[PDB]
Design a protein around this ligand. Structure first.
Ligand SMILES: *[C@@H]1O[C@H](CO)[C@@H](O[C@@H]2O[C@H](CO)[C@@H](O)[C@H](O)[C@H]2NC(C)=O)[C@H](O)[C@H]1NC(C)=O
Ligand SMILES: *[C@@H]1O[C@H](CO)[C@@H](O[C@@H]2O[C@H](CO)[C@@H](O)[C@H](O)[C@H]2NC(C)=O)[C@H](O)[C@H]1NC(C)=O
Ligand SMILES: *[C@@H]1O[C@H](CO)[C@@H](O[C@@H]2O[C@H](CO)[C@@H](O)[C@H](O)[C@H]2NC(C)=O)[C@H](O)[C@H]1NC(C)=O
Ligand SMILES: *[C@@H]1O[C@H](CO)[C@@H](O[C@@H]2O[C@H](CO)[C@@H](O)[C@H](O)[C@H]2NC(C)=O)[C@H](O)[C@H]1NC(C)=O
Ligand code: RUM
Ligand code: RUM
Ligand code: NAG
Ligand code: NAG
Ligand code: NAG
Ligand code: NAG
Ligand code: NAG
Ligand code: NAG
Ligand code: NAG
Ligand code: NAG
Lengths: 730, 724
């Protein structure tokens, strides 16, 4: 054997986590210290020295299994979370206890109730806010009785300080709708009203011992349905009394929003007494930022009309998925935020509190991904400028007083193994951890930002590097192709000892939704790794029209027309890959999950002749079935006067006849609250009505993730069988 | 050329019938056009033309003529609900005046309609209430006012009575001359509801949630009340008074079912009741009282049918056939040795004398006259799968004549019958083993009148096709005969090895081995794919005595499962079977057994298909399930409910390839049952195949769905058997 690499990355390796990626997950507490787990240690960023903060043996004497913990800003208390029951993507329920660190014992008086929906410390000190039964409660001291803020909370109808289904999944990517002011004086919150929002009902089968299935009911607005309404409040937590009910000052939306349906899309405190709100019209091409000041003598809030900021688009929607968040200066009279410039690229605009015109501090044919830190002299941000590779990510430092003075902080640190960065800054940005994902093994490092120099390697994944040495791994090839003189990027997971003169089977792995990017420099140990390493399949992905991080010309091209250009662009990509000479074009497949599944289906249903088989997992089948926020963002309204015509023309069903030429596998979890089972039940019924044979698989009580341990392994195995079969692999 | 899948799916080769409805004692109607036929001469005059209702505007689903021949009821806007229940719109056509009635019409969405046995009285059910029309044009009298959707059912059955007790939707029973209307009332107030999604048309944005009161095993059952109203005295001024007939004391002590309703005379009615523990039933004889207007059922006229080894009746206690004076009746009961035979009863006497004997069974009493009782049984040649018509001389029980045995003994061994109003004539229908044969006979001398349908059309076409053949036979297990049948590929060679598919029902009182001629999926598999399709009636199967039928009492998922495995083993030792390629497939109970077999880890089968299978007995209804299992409680039979689940055998599915199929709108076997099978396979990491059918019910019966499922299964099987 002469020590040559003979083992490959098998499906068992993938499903059983044989080759694990180490992460260095930390959480800052001061400007120079952070916490890390092994045990819980406080690490000193300056010297590297660490002392055990909390011994792993301290909560042995407890009684319950602890899911997570949260130390208070002042480090005097720790919140212990147990009895975790998942709800949707972000939401959950849990019991909480509070351990006093200075007394070294559990608070037994005035306990946080069972079935708490959300709990949060103030940014400083140890105030506590939580939601239980859809109502907000505040504890000024962990061991004292809590003041009740709201009294209107009602299951599925009124949500105080937590989000409803749609706001959670599509707007805030969070269950939480509470925001403390910087020093914990104020507590801003949203209230959602789902009174007339229609219910999605579906069976939940539960344990085998449940005799009668459960019907799950969720207020869920499908495209065009009645949306939930939103109200916003601020309460002063320092003027609470155990005798009068707490007074919550309502901040109303600007007049231009109240005119019709709207959303609250962003909350950001500017200072201790100034808060910024962003609102969005249901037709999501117009948004208004309000800046509101606390009035001393009256105790209310005022958003002066002269400080309003309008962001809008003529070619699409506003923001990548919502309007970008402002980053304020210490005085709160200025802010920085990412918006698209004249040539349609997203860049950092510098705004003054009460002037309409902002000046662009970054320029170019690339985009700023996010503003990560702001100090007195520098602003830190992540972008894909380096070598003009949209699929890359680096940290940049821009001088506030000289816009020509831009330094790349990460570009050249490790040019070959590191081209995809994310960052974690200390409380005042004195230190930061850098996180590199690819194209090589993930690497974690710590830095001093004063001189920009590495202090030490946090995690280098050498234990994994050891194991990979003997393994025939795949390679990635990230490159591009010209189409209508526009550059379009693709990535290919290529099998070991790749021969360009040989013909390989090809799997097109697609997402292709608005602002997607499936062509990047990230290192992954996934299903594709196996298919390449073990089965000698090339797994490609392509970013056609509608994909993000390369300007609005590309991203907005699909505006109001989902299921058109991006679908055709995937098809075209496959024609292109064939023309590279190393693809067996009688063995070309396509798969995808969510939007990816929709595109897969539209492609297999298009009678193009290019694809032999495909897998759709939890796909949308028709847009009137999916939620309003996401769908209307790109499709407008499903009404005759708006966009009904394209809603009606862009379904999977009406292409059922075409599936007679392809082998189709269709997978869906019965308890999918996101993309409802309904959607696959309509595809299956259409394929039956035209007499088309297909393969199928439902996952009892699985949701959109099909993410449970056993279900995950079973679907990937099932898909691997289907693919090997379609490609004639033994 | 062979019989193909397309052949079966698109019905290229059609079995012709001869469906008739006796109108009098020498006349019957026959669809074409609708003709009246004389049983004597065979001449026919048209009753109504093909398109007499050309200007009707509605699509006519079914016609129904009144007994006095004066009015025809027309049915349209037919909307199927469950197996037997449906909704419809109606119109009444005056045959004399040649025009539709337009005043006081029958409402839209009527649940049930029926003429009285004589004349033209007409009762219907609408919004769970009973109405009566004396005359087609006159207003209707409202009988009941308590009808409430999903809660109270007057004159119609709820889900469990429709499916498992009466095999019908109607709970209405006219007396023989129409004076009385007897009806049942069902109360579903505390019966839990099965809920499931209905997705409907693509244009429905939010799925429908269907909810049906449906008692699963050991749950709260509907309650029942029995009433009788006098239709001859109906005031349009005062509310109609309904006389309740309460169940006997021996039944009121606990949960019970009304299982049979039979009029004896113009003033005497019999009711059979069954304890929820279905091994005890009581028959009441109730007499109308004149100078009081009530109904009386003496404790001395009660008859008790019970069983120590099992449940009572095949599926329900048998129905009684009364003499004209109604002082005597005949009904099928199991004898001392466990075989079902006819007992003769006296209304007054506790004892009954058996009039038939032997190691075979009476299938049913067909007609009772002054001097003869006619019945069907499987006695001919000791074949439990045969059916012949028998005449028994009432003055002397030893004089028994087989009326169908020798008519055409090669092609005909399975007969059903249809006697005219007074049994003057009868139509014999022969279902196999050759092509079906329909003949008319005179009962005064048993002589044949004529052949009605001989299927010589089909016979011609079938001459051009390489058809399979059928072998019916038995094997001996523990000194007992167990019957099996086999569909054999054409030009069958004993010295060749064939893939074999076991077709399984195997539920209690099932019979899958018989002489019937069938054109079905199995026919295609034997014709085109060269697969033997075998069936086998092991323990728990019917028409062979209690000893075999009651064997699985309280033990579903055991002996009947073990016996399907042994059958396959016996089939292996027959020499012409490739034991590397044996499969099993089954629908309903058929699916439950198929899954149990595949999960047994016997090593016998490579693969199997389970369509809409029961997965565990607590998921299934009370009536059927508790008939065999008792109650799922710790003091009764909880342990065996917990032992007989498909889920518990999930580990063994690693040895087989499994295809698991279910309609999502199945009201009978809830998708629940298959959802739990798959969860279990998932939890132990077994790869299997699945297919759901959106909005299909237990039948998966829609044109396209039907063609889809059979096509999908053919692929699975061809793949399992390495067939191109
Ligand atoms: C949530 O919103 C609903 C309607 O979206 C509110 O219900 C309305 O209340 C108004 C004013 O009292 C009444 O005119 C109607 O009875 C309701 N409208 C309709 C047509 O449903 C409800 O008050 C709101 N709940 C809260 C506490 O904010
Ligand atoms: C704080 O507000 C709550 C909720 O409105 C008050 O509780 C209700 O008071 C109203 C009338 O004032 C009564 O009709 C209800 O019976 C009360 N409902 C309950 C118990 O939630 C509460 O009293 C207020 N607290 C004070 C004293 O200011
Ligand atoms: C159907 O059965 C239900 C359930 O037993 C009966 O409802 C009861 O009626 C009595 C008298 O009206 C009440 O005191 C009880 O509260 C009821 N029980 C429940 C839980 O509903 C009802 O009488 C029956 N209805 C008919 C028309 O027969
Ligand atoms: C026949 O009986 C029914 C039900 O008992 C009567 O209908 C109800 O009559 C009572 C008063 O007798 C009212 O309080 C109810 O509201 C009625 N129910 C409805 C809406 O149908 C009916 O009136 C009686 N009819 C005759 C002919 O006496
Ligand atoms: N989730 C989801 C989802 C479902 C149906 C259609 C489109 C989407 C958008 N989406 C998202 N999200 C994008 C918007 C924010 C969240 N809803 C998650 N993540 C991954 C894929 Br693949 C995808 O298609
Ligand atoms: N139907 C049904 C059904 C469902 C689950 C278990 C057992 C049955 C009984 N059954 C019936 N019925 C038997 C009893 C009367 C009706 N319920 C229909 N017909 C055909 C097959 Br195969 C079968 O398994
Ligand atoms: C690190 O070392 C210093 C030495 O002065 C010590 O005092 C300190 O406690 C250590 N830091 C932490 C946070 O453990
Ligand atoms: C939470 O639930 C547990 C167990 O049901 C109970 O013992 C505990 O006291 C509860 N916590 C409180 C007091 O809210
Ligand atoms: C936080 O800010 C508020 C409002 O400006 C101020 O009144 C309060 O004193 C501050 N908190 C502390 C303790 O500094
Ligand atoms: C927003 O969208 C609608 C419909 O696409 C369009 O008519 C309108 O002009 C847009 N508004 C703005 C401010 O561009
Ligand atoms: C049949 O013909 C006879 C006379 O030959 C006649 O009396 C009878 O009415 C006819 N019946 C029918 C229904 O055609
Ligand atoms: C049945 O319904 C239709 C349309 O809804 C109506 O026109 C017709 O008259 C109805 N028939 C009766 C008898 O009510
Ligand atoms: C039917 O029987 C009843 C009750 O015995 C009797 O009064 C009546 O005469 C009969 N009806 C007719 C019209 O034959
Ligand atoms: C009927 O019910 C059960 C059957 O398990 C049994 O205990 C009881 O003895 C039976 N009754 C009779 C007398 O058959």
């Amino acid at each position: 054997h002469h020590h040559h690499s003979r083992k490959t990355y098998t499906l068992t390796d993938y499903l059983k986590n044989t080759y694990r990626l180490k992460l260095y997950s930390l959480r800052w507490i001061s400007d120079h210290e952070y916490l890390y787990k092994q045990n819980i240690l406080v690490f000193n960023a300056e010297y590297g020295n660490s002392s055990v903060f909390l011994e792993n043996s301290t909560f042995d004497e407890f009684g319950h299994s602890i899911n997570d913990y949260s130390i208070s800003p002042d480090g005097q208390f720790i919140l212990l979370e147990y009895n975790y029951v998942k709800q949707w993507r972000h939401s959950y329920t849990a019991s909480y206890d509070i351990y006093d660190l200075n007394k070294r014992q559990l608070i037994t008086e005035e306990r946080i109730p069972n079935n708490t929906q959300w709990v949060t410390w103030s940014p400083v000190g140890h105030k506590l806010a939580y939601v239980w039964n859809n109502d907000i409660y505040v504890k000024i001291e962990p061991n004292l009785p809590s003041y009740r803020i709201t009294w209107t909370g009602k299951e599925d109808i009124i949500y105080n300080g937590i989000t409803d289904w749609v706001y959670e999944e599509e707007v805030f990517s969070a269950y939480s709708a509470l925001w403390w002011s910087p020093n914990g004086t104020f507590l801003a919150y949203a209230q959602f009203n789902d009174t007339e929002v229609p219910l999605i009902e579906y069976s939940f089968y539960s344990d085998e011992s449940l005799q009668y299935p459960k019907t799950v009911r969720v207020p869920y607005p499908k495209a065009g349905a009645v949306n939930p309404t939103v109200k916003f409040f601020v309460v002063n937590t320092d003027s609470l009394s155990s005798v009068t009910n707490a007074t919550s000052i309502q901040i109303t939306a600007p007049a231009s929003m109240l005119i019709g349906d709207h959303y609250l899309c962003d909350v950001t405190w500017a200072t201790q007494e100034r808060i910024s709100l962003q609102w969005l019209r249901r037709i999501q091409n117009y948004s208004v930022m309000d800046i509101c000041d606390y009035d001393e003598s009256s105790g209310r809030w005022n958003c002066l009309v002269a400080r309003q900021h309008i962001e809008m688009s003529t070619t699409g929607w506003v923001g990548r998925f919502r309007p970008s968040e402002p980053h304020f200066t210490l005085d709160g009279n200025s802010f920085y935020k990412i918006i698209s410039n004249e040539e349609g690229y997203r860049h950092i605009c510098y705004f003054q509190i009460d002037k309409k015109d902002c000046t662009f501090i970054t320029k170019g044919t690339w985009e700023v991904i996010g503003i990560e830190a702001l100090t007195s002299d520098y602003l830190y941000y992540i972008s894909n400028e380096y070598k003009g590779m949209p699929g890359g990510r680096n940290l940049y430092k821009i001088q506030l007083s000289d816009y020509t003075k831009v330094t790349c902080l990460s570009c050249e640190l490790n040019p070959e193994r590191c081209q995809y960065y994310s960052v974690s800054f200390s409380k005042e940005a004195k230190y930061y951890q850098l996180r590199c994902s690819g194209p090589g093994l993930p690497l974690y490092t710590l830095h001093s930002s004063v001189n920009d120099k590495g202090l030490r390697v946090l995690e280098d994944n050498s234990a994994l590097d050891k194991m990979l040495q003997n393994v025939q791994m795949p390679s990635k090839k990230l490159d591009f192709i010209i189409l209508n003189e526009t550059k379009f990027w693709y990535q290919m997971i290529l099998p070991p000892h790749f021969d360009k003169s040989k013909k390989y089977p090809l799997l097109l792995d697609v997402y292709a939704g608005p602002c997607s990017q499936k062509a990047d420099t990230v290192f992954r140990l996934n299903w594709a790794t196996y298919l390449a390493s073990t089965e000698n399949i090339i797994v490609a992905s392509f970013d056609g029209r509608g994909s993000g991080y390369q300007g609005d010309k590309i991203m907005h091209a699909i505006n109001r027309r989902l299921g058109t250009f991006e679908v055709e662009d995937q098809i075209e990509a496959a024609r292109q890959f064939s023309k590279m000479g190393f693809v067996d074009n009688k063995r070309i497949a396509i798969w995808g999950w969510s939007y990816g599944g929709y595109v897969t289906s539209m492609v297999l249903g298009s009678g193009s002749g290019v694809f032999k088989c495909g897998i759709a997992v939890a796909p949308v089948s028709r847009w009137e079935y999916y939620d309003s926020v996401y769908t209307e963002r790109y499709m407008g309204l499903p009404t005759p006067e708006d966009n009904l015509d394209h809603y009606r023309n862009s379904t999977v069903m009406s292409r059922a006849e075409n599936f007679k030429q392809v082998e189709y596998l269709l997978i869906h979890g019965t308890a999918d609250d996101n993309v409802h089972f309904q959607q696959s039940a309509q595809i299956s019924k259409a394929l039956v009505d035209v007499g088309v044979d297909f393969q199928a698989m439902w996952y009892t009580d699985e949701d959109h993730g099909i993410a449970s341990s056993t279900a995950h392994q079973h679907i990937y195995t099932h898909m691997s069988h289907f693919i090997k079969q379609c490609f004639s692999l033994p």
